[PDB]
Amino acid sequence: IETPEQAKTRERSEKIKLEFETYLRRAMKRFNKGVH
Amino acid sequence: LEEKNRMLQEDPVLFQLYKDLVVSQVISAEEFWANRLQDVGISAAFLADVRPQTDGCNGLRYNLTSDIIESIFRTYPAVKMKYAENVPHNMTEKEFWTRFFQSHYFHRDGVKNPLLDLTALEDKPLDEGYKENSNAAIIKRFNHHSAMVLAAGLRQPAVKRAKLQESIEYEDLGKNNSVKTIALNLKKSDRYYHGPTPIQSLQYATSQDIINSFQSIRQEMEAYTPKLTQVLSSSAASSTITALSPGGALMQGGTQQAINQMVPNDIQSELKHLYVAVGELLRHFWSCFPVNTPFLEEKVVKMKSNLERFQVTKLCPFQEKIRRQYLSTNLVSHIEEMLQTAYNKLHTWQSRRLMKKT
């Protein structure tokens, strides 16, 4: 209801950070499972 | 007391007048204030017009105003319930407004029988043998809001017969009396021909000698020739100039005196204050007059006592202040005239009352 473009940019930043951190999480799980 | 003090502060001259009338014991505060002593309709545009002010520097200026909230409460009593059930404990007011903006509540995008009972308009109600949801919701809530606004605007066979009579009657084939006037015809119209002009000694001329004079002048001017030298003379011209000369009889009076410098501006302002005070006192006196009830007698007696007290406590010091400067202006004379006129009026009315009783 206030500066919708700022809210959309925040949502995009959250989305890209979430994708980055989730793929990092998957890579870390692959790494430790391979170590085991 | 606090409200009265604030109101007096809003008018310092009255506050000064109130002080000069009460502290000087001229009048009591009860008698002082004895004579001394906005709703907005519901508009349907209070929602669409009112928007969250989105100032460019990411400013969400709500501009929360009491009238807007009152209009919302009147139109939507549910909002009043939500406000009363949440603040100040469950949630803050601004957070509630923000939730209202984000909620779907904001971003939503018969007494008369004959012509209202649509269910009863048909005498054959047999059985059924002989984004639509969004649109329906929008229509329903719009109708609800309109009904709420209409209701907030306010804040039997006889009825049916009256409605039918109103509906059927034709203004053309009725009555058109419209004669709500009273004619006037005075008795003697000659009163206005010679009106408030007093009687004048409009003397009539003599007997037929008047006709003789008329014939004489008629013959005299019947053979007339224009003249030029006889029109005026220097001696007559000199007399006319002298009459028109400065200081002449036609030039009545002459130069005058600067009254402004003769009286100090402080004395002038105090004279204005005394004028207003005496004027209001005498206005109340004349409002009481004429005394048609026994209660008015005591009120006018108190008025005279207040006038006497005010005169003694202010004008006499004011008279002394003027007299020390030896001002030649008789400003006090006007006040004395008014006071004596009122006192004589009251004394004469008392004399009349005594005469009527005896």
Curated annotation (Swiss-Prot), chain B:
Residues with Phosphoserine modification: 167
Similarity comment: Belongs to the TFB1 family.
GO cellular component terms attached to this protein's record: nucleoplasm; transcription factor TFIIH core complex; transcription factor TFIIH holo complex
Main location: nucleus
Changes after translation: (Microbial infection) Upon Rift valley fever virus infection, interacts with NSs leading to ubiquitination by the NSs-FBXO3 E3 ligase and proteasome-dependent degradation.
Keywords: Acetylation, DNA damage, DNA repair, Host-virus interaction, Nucleus, Phosphoprotein, Repeat, Transcription, Transcription regulation, Ubl conjugation
Subcellular location field: Nucleus
Assembly information from the UniProt record: Component of the 7-subunit TFIIH core complex composed of XPB/ERCC3, XPD/ERCC2, GTF2H1, GTF2H2, GTF2H3, GTF2H4 and GTF2H5, which is active in NER. The core complex associates with the 3-subunit CDK-activating kinase (CAK) module composed of CCNH/cyclin H, CDK7 and MNAT1 to form the 10-subunit holoenzyme (holo-TFIIH) active in transcription. Interacts with PUF60. (Microbial infection) Interacts with Rift valley fever virus NSs (via OmegaXaV motif); the interaction leads to TFIIH complex proteasomal degradation.
BP-aspect Gene Ontology terms: DNA repair; hormone-mediated signaling pathway; nucleotide-excision repair; positive regulation of DNA-templated transcription; regulation of cyclin-dependent protein serine/threonine kinase activity; transcription by RNA polymerase I; transcription by RNA polymerase II; transcription initiation at RNA polymerase II promoter
Keyword Transcription regulation: yes
Keyword presence, Oxidoreductase: no
Domain BSD: 1-37, 56-108
Name listed for the protein in its UniProt record: General transcription factor IIH subunit 1
Protein's organism: Homo sapiens (Human)
Function: Component of the general transcription and DNA repair factor IIH (TFIIH) core complex, which is involved in general and transcription-coupled nucleotide excision repair (NER) of damaged DNA and, when complexed to CAK, in RNA transcription by RNA polymerase II. In NER, TFIIH acts by opening DNA around the lesion to allow the excision of the damaged oligonucleotide and its replacement by a new DNA fragment. In transcription, TFIIH has an essential role in transcription initiation.
